[PDB]
């Protein structure tokens, strides 16, 4: 008994959940009207991709 024989892996597979519920970045950088700098608009971003 000399060595050990192995089957080397061939490909790499990455499976994750389907992409949905993206963070509303399109509502921040693309707005019809912006805000003055003194009254700067602050939006909290959570529970989203």
């Amino acid at each position, epitope marked *: 008994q000399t060595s050990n024989f192995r089957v080397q892996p061939t490909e790499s597979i990455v499976r994750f959940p389907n992409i949905t519920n993206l963070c509303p970045f399109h509502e921040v950088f693309n707005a019809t*009207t912006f805000a003055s700098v003194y*009254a700067w*608009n*602050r939006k909290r971003i959570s529970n989203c991709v």
Partner: nanobody
Amino acid sequence: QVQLQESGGGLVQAGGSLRLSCAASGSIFSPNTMGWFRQALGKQREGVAFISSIASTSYWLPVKGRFTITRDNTKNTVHLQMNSLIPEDTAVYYCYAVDKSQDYWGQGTQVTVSS
């Protein structure tokens, strides 16, 4: 989405009286401060007078007696009373709602005086 209803403008002779009114419907979050701006024909935009939510008033022109601000807490509206009207105040007016996060603007009222 906030709608600022403007009403009470038009043609008035010298020394007349009128009552501008801005009603803020929509978001208009609780710590609001309401103000009025003046836009002379082809000139810069200056601030008529501002009223806060604690009834504190800050007039941005030596104009006391001319403008008086009345507050309606039940409907969160602001009325501007105009008296002793003189030709140099002939300008369109917009009301300014700072709210807390995003400030808004009115549509416009034509205030005119001549003789």
